[PDB]
Design a binder for this molecule. Structure first.
Ligand SMILES: [Mg+2]
Ligand SMILES: [Mg+2]
Ligand SMILES: [Mg+2]
Ligand SMILES: [Mg+2]
Ligand SMILES: [Mg+2]
Ligand SMILES: [Mg+2]
Ligand SMILES: [Mg+2]
Ligand SMILES: [Mg+2]
Ligand SMILES: [Mg+2]
Ligand SMILES: [Mg+2]
Ligand SMILES: [Mg+2]
Ligand SMILES: [Mg+2]
Ligand SMILES: [Mg+2]
Ligand SMILES: [Mg+2]
Ligand SMILES: [Mg+2]
Ligand SMILES: [Mg+2]
Ligand SMILES: [Mg+2]
Ligand SMILES: [Mg+2]
Ligand SMILES: [Mg+2]
Ligand SMILES: [Mg+2]
Ligand SMILES: [Mg+2]
Lengths: 153, 70, 154, 117
RNA sequence: AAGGCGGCCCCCUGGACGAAGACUGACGCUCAGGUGCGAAAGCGUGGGGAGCAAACAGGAUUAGAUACCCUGGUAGUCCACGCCGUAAACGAUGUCGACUUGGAGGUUGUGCCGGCGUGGCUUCCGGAGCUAACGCGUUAAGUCGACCGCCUGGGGAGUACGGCCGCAAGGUUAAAACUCAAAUGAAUUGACGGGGGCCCGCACAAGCGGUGGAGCAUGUGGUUUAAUUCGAUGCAA
RNA sequence: GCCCGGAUAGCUCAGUCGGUAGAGCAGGGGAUUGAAAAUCCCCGUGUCCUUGGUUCGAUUCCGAGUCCGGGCACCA
RNA sequence: AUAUUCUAA
RNA sequence: GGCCCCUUAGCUCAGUGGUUAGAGCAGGCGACUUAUAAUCGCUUGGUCGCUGGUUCAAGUCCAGCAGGGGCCACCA
């Protein structure tokens, strides 16, 4: 907004693993304020990823996030007359948001039967560096390398 | 402008000192002036305009020390 | 912004020109238009012309008994042949008074053929000119000016 | 082929393009790279970055000569004239001296008419 | 003098200004007609031609684009001589003389002892007064005198016709009919600007979920009808 | 009078040489706009000039006409 | 870079 | 009669090399825009005009064909 008074809203840590990061993920996955439904889908998908990794559910999530997290994105800002698309370093909070949001968007457009599986599959494909998630990080990295020339300081 | 780098001198310094040497000689401003022909009439009009602004800045310096705002 | 600058429609039936003949002339309209920003009343007019269907236009046959055909020696080059030969045709159409001369070819038959063709074209063009003038004048009178002052109906 | 050791780096900076040309003291060209030929057209071609990337490619085109020290000559008033030197330095060369040789007339030929944009 | 005049050097040459004197003795001021000078473009003849650039050509842009932008490019721009005689040729302010508080500079002389006077030219502010107002204000648009030029509603028209001038382009002098009830100057309040500055609102941006496609509900337009009762119609039906 | 070319969407035109037709501009419906252009999205559009043949089948290949344009109608 | 127009009470 | 050059993705194009690939405009979706433009990112897709052989893996290396053009040749 025009003022700049945004007191970062107080968010509860999730019950099972006690992680605000994963509590956020649930929120991003959640639909029609049906969190119960969402939490079940996340724990199921993290339990599955626990088996197909041999690691902690949080640690298996961290590994996935890391290969999704973009470092520099494109933002359109005017300098003179022309409207150029300019690379901006992404803030660490927005690094996770995008990541989590990209994964869920990626894991909502697969053929597999249950969302819990679709999520587990994409969170796994992320860990390897294959999934549509970790295909649109590249895209949002390389489009932020073409316009590298517009990074005036 | 011609900067010779001296013994035991870092580069970043010798570059800032080159930048300054060109800005002092007014090279970039000189070439921007020579880019397009300004009609003499236009050259006189902007010389006049500048002097009027330089002079009006003097009269816009008194009404500040003499007059109070709060 | 809609409507028509002009709309010409044939209305076909039994007793049309007996009921629409009186629509001819100026129609004055007084209202707040659709093209008006300030809600002002404006006074516009439209001209309506209702002209009855004139029996098409039968281009008639060129009756040879209504022609005077003159044959004579052609003018200019062509040695002994052009000196001695009645090549040249003047066809005078007695009704209209239109006269066409033709001596473009060396043969009287070609000339006469060409002249009948032209005399046809010129007779048929002259009567289609009358019809246009008659129609133009008839319309001119029905319409009147498009001015708000010249109206049969408000 | 033939070692030269001490050479000159000419930097033709225009509003549109940047042309780096690394020569010897006698002014015989060894290698050159342009911002326009370095994967940059239009807007992106007239930026200090593309003039940086160009400088690099010119350094990476005269290593076979083994230039150790450069005299730099900057020309014209474009974004190329600053960052091209930073690149040459950061590419490993030793900048002996930096000279501006931008041609200034002493009131000579009539420039072209002013653009009405 | 105006138009104008800008590297450096020489040659020829005009004016201005200051200082002290000496000299002439109203020899002055203004000026219809007249004469001369007079930017740029343009014209003639002969040169010249780097750069620039009417015309022109192509490329773009665009609804079109005989433009603006781009690539070229001829006259021209340069020289000699001749012509043209006009410019918002403006200070939109005729020339000459006198008089009428101040302040701050610039520039160029000069007298006296880093100070104190006195001239010339010139920039900016401002007092009285003047002015419709804006402004001008000892360089007057103040206070006066001399002489000249010029104006008399807006269009038509600085045009026609005639004359004079010119190679031409054109210049100069200069009407009438007809037509309108205005045209105009300055300033004031707004509104507006693809003017400037500063702010705000889910206005954008950041997000999330919709509508626009499907079927149905419902209102409307239209069309239909004996009747499809009347009203609401951008946002704000 | 003869000869060559042409006849294809509402207009100007491609196309095909035996099977199954396009373009641009119009046109319609939507969007954008206070509204009209410009612009954007969705659509539709042909007896392929008329006949009489050949052919399983003709816009296409014959042979007639019709309309349009372009020649020519001469040596003397 | 591109933004034309708005009769007449 | 000889030589040759090239005829690869919708439209095109380009070419080493032991292979059917590299694009650039198009065509799809993304970003961008006040909206168009341009911009950028992502993808999309050849019997290398065909056809033989020959090659550890040959459209090429080498034949037999088709295809067009460019210059030269051509005294039943
Ligand atoms: Mg230019
Ligand atoms: Mg006089
Ligand atoms: Mg001149
Ligand atoms: Mg001349
Ligand atoms: Mg000459
Ligand atoms: Mg030009
Ligand atoms: Mg005058
Ligand atoms: Mg002047
Ligand atoms: Mg002046
Ligand atoms: Mg005057
Ligand atoms: Mg005088
Ligand atoms: Mg004053
Ligand atoms: Mg005159
Ligand atoms: Mg006269
Ligand atoms: Mg938004
Ligand atoms: Mg619907
Ligand atoms: Mg109703
Ligand atoms: Mg109503
Ligand atoms: Mg009522
Ligand atoms: Mg009402
Ligand atoms: Mg109009």
């Amino acid at each position: 907004p025009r003022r700049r008074v945004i007191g970062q809203r107080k968010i509860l840590p999730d019950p099972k693993f006690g992680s605000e990061l994963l509590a956020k993920f649930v929120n991003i996955l959640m639909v029609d304020g049906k969190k119960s439904t969402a939490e079940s889908i996340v724990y199921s998908a993290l339990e599955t990823l626990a088996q197909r990794s041999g690691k902690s559910e949080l640690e298996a999530f961290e590994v996935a996030l890391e290969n999704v997290r973009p470092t520099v994105e494109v933002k359109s800002r005017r300098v003179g007359g022309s409207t150029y698309q300019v690379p901006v370093e992404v803030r660490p909070v927005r690094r996770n948001a995008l990541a989590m949001r990209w994964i869920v968007e990626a894991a909502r457009k697969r053929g597999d039967k249950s969302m819990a599986l679709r999520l587990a599959n994409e969170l796994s494909d992320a860990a390897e560096n294959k999934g549509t998630a970790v295909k649109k990080r590249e895209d949002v990295h390389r489009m932020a390398e073409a316009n590298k020339a517009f990074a005036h300081y | 402008p011609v900067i010779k780098v001296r013994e035991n001198e870092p580069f970043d310094v010798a570059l800032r000192r080159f930048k300054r040497s060109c800005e002092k000689a007014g090279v970039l401003a000189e070439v921007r002036r020579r880019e397009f022909y300004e009609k003499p009439t236009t050259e006189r009009k902007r010389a006049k305009a500048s002097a009027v602004k330089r002079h009006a800045k003097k009269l816009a310096r008194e009404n500040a020390r003499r007059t109070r705002l709060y | 912004h809609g409507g028509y600058k002009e709309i010409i429609a044939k209305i076909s039936g039994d007793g049309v020109y007996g009921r629409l003949k009186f629509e001819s002339g100026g129609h004055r309209v007084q209202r707040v238009p659709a093209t008006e920003s300030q809600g002002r009343i404006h006074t516009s007019a439209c001209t309506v012309a209702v002209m009855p269907e004139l029996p098409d236009a039968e281009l008639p046959d060129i009756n040879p008994a209504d022609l005077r055909i003159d044959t004579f020696r052609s003018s200019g080059a062509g040695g002994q042949h052009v000196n001695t030969t009645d090549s040249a045709i003047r066809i005078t159409h007695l009704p209209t008074g239109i006269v066409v001369e033709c001596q473009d070819e060396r043969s009287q038959h070609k000339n006469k053929a060409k002249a009948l063709s032209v005399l046809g074209a010129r007779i048929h063009a002259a009567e289609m000119a009358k019809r246009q003038q008659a129609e133009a004048s008839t319309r001119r009178n029905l319409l009147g000016s498009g001015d708000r002052s010249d109206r049969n109906r408000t | 082929r033939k070692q030269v050791s001490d050479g000159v780096a000419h930097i033709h900076a225009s509003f549109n393009n940047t042309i780096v040309t690394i020569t010897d003291r006698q002014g015989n060209a060894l290698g050159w790279a342009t911002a326009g030929g370095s994967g940059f057209r239009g807007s992106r071609k007239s930026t200090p970055f593309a003039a940086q990337v160009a400088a690099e490619r010119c350094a990476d085109a005269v290593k076979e000569y083994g230039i150790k020290n450069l005299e730099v000559m900057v020309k014209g008033p474009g974004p190329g004239r600053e960052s091209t030197i930073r690149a040459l330095n950061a590419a490993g060369f030793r900048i002996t001296n930096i000279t501006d040789v931008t041609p200034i007339p002493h009131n000579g030929c009539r420039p072209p008419k002013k653009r009405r944009v």
